[PDB]
Design a protein around this ligand. Sequence first.
Ligand SMILES: *[C@H]1O[C@H](CO)[C@@H](O[C@@H]2O[C@H](CO)[C@@H](O[C@@H]3O[C@H](CO[C@H]4O[C@H](CO)[C@@H](O)[C@H](O)[C@@H]4O)[C@@H](O)[C@H](O[C@H]4O[C@H](CO)[C@@H](O)[C@H](O)[C@@H]4O[C@H]4O[C@H](CO)[C@@H](O)[C@H](O)[C@@H]4O)[C@@H]3O)[C@H](O)[C@H]2NC(C)=O)[C@H](O)[C@H]1NC(C)=O
Lengths: 61, 147, 414, 61, 304, 113
Amino acid sequence: VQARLNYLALQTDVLQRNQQLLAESFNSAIGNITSAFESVKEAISQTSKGLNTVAHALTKV
Amino acid sequence: AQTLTKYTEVQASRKLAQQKVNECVKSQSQRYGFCGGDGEHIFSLVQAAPQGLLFLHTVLVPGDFVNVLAIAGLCVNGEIALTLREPGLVLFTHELQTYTATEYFVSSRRMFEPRKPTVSDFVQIESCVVTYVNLTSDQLPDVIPDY
Amino acid sequence: EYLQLYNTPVSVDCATYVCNGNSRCKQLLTQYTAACKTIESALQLSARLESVEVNSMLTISEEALQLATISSFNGDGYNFTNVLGAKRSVIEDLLFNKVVTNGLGTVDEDYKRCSNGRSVADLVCAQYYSGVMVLPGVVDAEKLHMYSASLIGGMALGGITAAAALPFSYAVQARLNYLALQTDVLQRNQQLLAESFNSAIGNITSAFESVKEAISQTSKGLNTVAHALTKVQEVVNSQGSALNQLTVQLQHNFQAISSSIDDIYSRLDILSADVQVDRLITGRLSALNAFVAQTLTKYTEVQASRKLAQQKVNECVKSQSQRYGFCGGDGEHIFSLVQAAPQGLLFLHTVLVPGDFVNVLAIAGLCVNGEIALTLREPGLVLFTHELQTYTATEYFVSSRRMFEPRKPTVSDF
Amino acid sequence: EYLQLYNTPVSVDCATYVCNGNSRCKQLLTQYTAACKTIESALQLSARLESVEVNSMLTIS
Amino acid sequence: NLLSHEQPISFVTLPSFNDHSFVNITVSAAFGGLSSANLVASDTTINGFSSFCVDTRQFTITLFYNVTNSYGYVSKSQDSNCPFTLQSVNDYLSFSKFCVSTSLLAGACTIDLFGYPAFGSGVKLTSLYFQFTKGELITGTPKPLEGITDVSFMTLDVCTKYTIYGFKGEGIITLTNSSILAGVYYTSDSGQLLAFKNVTSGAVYSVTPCSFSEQAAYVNDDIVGVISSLSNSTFNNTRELPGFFYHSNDGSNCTEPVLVYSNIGVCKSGSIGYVPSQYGQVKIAPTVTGNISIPTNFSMSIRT
Amino acid sequence: GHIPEGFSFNNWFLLSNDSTLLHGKVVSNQPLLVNCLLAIPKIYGLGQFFSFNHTMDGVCNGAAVDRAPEALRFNINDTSVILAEGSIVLHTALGTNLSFVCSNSSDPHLATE
Ligand SMILES: *[C@H]1O[C@H](CO)[C@@H](O[C@@H]2O[C@H](CO)[C@@H](O[C@@H]3O[C@H](CO[C@H]4O[C@H](CO)[C@@H](O)[C@H](O)[C@@H]4O)[C@@H](O)[C@H](O[C@H]4O[C@H](CO)[C@@H](O)[C@H](O)[C@@H]4O[C@H]4O[C@H](CO)[C@@H](O)[C@H](O)[C@@H]4O)[C@@H]3O)[C@H](O)[C@H]2NC(C)=O)[C@H](O)[C@H]1NC(C)=O
């Protein structure tokens, strides 16, 4: 993931936890797509129904 | 007719799925929104789904922006004009309210990743231009440490 | 280039189409198990999918839209007057008026007019009494205008402290740098670019109001405005086709003694009237299944245009494309504008075409003292001399291969 | 890789298909208003679009 | 619409007085035998003759059976090779000519009349051959119906079961001041009547179906509102929008739509509103010398 | 034998034994080829025999064409002109003549409007 960040911009300011705010933002994303794969349309808002999200993926499946 | 048109309707999805595997999953895409819409791509995972693939395009999105005065280039002694080589890098100062400033940095335009300028980032272009900072070889090492 | 984003959705009340509100026919129609469910939900679940796809790719940006719409856009030599508008632009008004004057169904019709018979019903209410409803177009020409201005103004958005629009001669200089690092900047070539674009946009706006008495075959090809106007008129004319053939199948009789159900039930015995109304029910359910098959393939034909339009917005309009021909065929791309068009977007891919070529001797590298071999680092740069008739020469330069922007070599290039 | 560029166009003389040159059938066929217009022009306008879209990408140098 | 048993009849036809003749048909047969019931000496007449052809602009067919079965009763039935039945000819059908005979006429359909004097196999009493031509002038009728300048009757503004120049249906008839200069009736491509003239006065009337199609917004297992052409409906609030009416139990605006289509949003309470365009995150144009902004703290997001 | 372009079509209707076309293009078999146009001033009637086997007579506008008609079009503005006994007689091929007659009574064997 560090090598994949370098293709966007060469990384420099590594001090003060600069990777952990990426890693814990992924943990809290993958732990939310896994809830949409078992929750129900009572918990849907119209932005959570768009062209690149899990409720549209399920409707298409 | 219904069955062959449904194979044709699916082939055009499978050609896209083979592109997303090769450009989002196996490599990384510089194509702005191909891997999962607006953001900067870093990786797509893949999961098996009923008759195809589910792609989990893990994009990067900015919570915050930093506002900086960009400098086109340096016009040293009014004689030699230096410009950054790479169109993906910006030369800047934090000191928005003034045409010239305390100290200078380089970063990508795509992520704020600052570094001090290096003599290998700049090329001497044929002519100076009115947008460039007026500067002297007596103070160019305040911009470029190791000049 | 014209890319269609959406298909005007259509809905049917199958009991009104098949039975004209006759009660005895509705009582027979429920025996055809789920024939109505499998027509209605195919049209409704598809009309919903279009609504969520198109409204979810038309993401406006509020801090970009305020730089275009006010016409306070600093073209700084470039005449954007035809593109912006205060409500639509000059090109958007000419493009609708060249086609939506002969067109239909791209202006949303009102059904309030057709519960009251104080006027004789026209075609678009004779369909409604036949039970078929064209819904409001998936996105209106004001949301579709705001999107286009949110993309034009998105090019002037240099930073979120958006106090004034960025002079467009700077956004074009940055877009030239991704082709070649510009060096001979104290030359007329920025005004050559600007006054060439001023003439090119003057010539597209004239083609939205000129006529085929002034067309030649090269001006009719794959990436020019006459091809876009043929493709726009093919969409606007085609939208009625499946919906007319649905409606005339109500005047077929399908071997029954009449084409109307209250005629049959008011003339045959009630045993034989059910037997003939089953041929009208079977025929009219088949006419709807044929219409659903036409309609779903016409959504699927659009979706590959929408996916391409979204790629061109992300790679040509929001960013810049290094892909050679994707934004408007052969030439170096710098920007594409967008405009609203009858059921989609019109792209104005502004590509740099060279008038002239310099001829120069390219040198692979330097073999210093027969010992140390210097080569350029970057395959985009060529090391050259102007002196073609000899193996070695007066003085040396480096430039891009894509544009002639010479500079002296630096110890950092090698 | 093989990619198809063009589909070999086909045109119909709608009165000749429907009536074989019988004069009294042509007379009847005119009562099916625009039935031949909406077959002929769909084939001719599509054959013309293939002509331009293919002969405009096959630019020789 | 709630007019099922109520709905008025309407009849509109080319202007006529009360010009009526009965086509009254007598069928006679005799029966006998003690070990089974069987038929002898059948005869048929229309107005006392073997054939009749209608000349007056209204007629009624009536059947008289004059069957003398010793076993006490006869049941009677009809077979039609025909687009009508004898009692249905009376129900306002229209024709260009109409002739009836006991003997085969040139283009004719058959009505065959049968009796069942002892239950099982029936016997044919008589055959009626009908020669007719679909048209406008000569109309079947139940009874001689009065009038001086016209025979036609209408009810306007109410859902009616109509015959208008041989078209039949249920609909609302309304007077329109959209005068039209040629013909007598105007039809859709759907083959359905849209308007017609009262040709004696030039006035044009328009026909609507009396149930229109609507879209019901269904949320949480109830119909919370309905989209319509109509100004009145069972819900207690109505709102007018540029293309349609919306009916609901709640006239407020909507800030949390559970359904959207285009820019129309329907809330859980049944409110309607307009839903704004989604706002995407800002992208920064490449620029050389302005005050620029560079993306800094980056979160991560999964797009599926 | 064609009707001139730019003629008004003041009271010429396209014929139907059916529904009437409100607007648009149609291609149809109509009595619009003209053999002659016998124009009579509104202050005169006329009595003539027009035969579906002979050429129409009497001086008539433009060039006369020697064809027997298939249709006769009468372009009368005030219908007071057509109501009299024997105002039209149609001679059927079966040798039966059919005569239009009008009465102020609903019984035909015998007041201004
Ligand atoms: C509304 O519906 C009515 C119903 O009447 C419809 O009437 C139909 O009109 C057409 C004319 O438009 C009539 O068609 C003609 O048919 C005859 C032959 O039919 C005969 O035989 C049957 C017996 O089985 C009889 O019942 C019937 O009465 C007839 O005797 C054809 O002869 C006619 O053709 C002539 O004209 C054609 C061009 O229109 C020529 O192509 C053809 O060669 C004939 O030309 C003749 O005249 C020419 C003049 O120069 C001459 O040069 C030629 O040598 C030749 O002599 C025509 O096809 C049909 O009868 C009517 N239907 C009925 C019930 O009879 C109305 O037209 C219709 N209205 C509209 C607008 O829809």
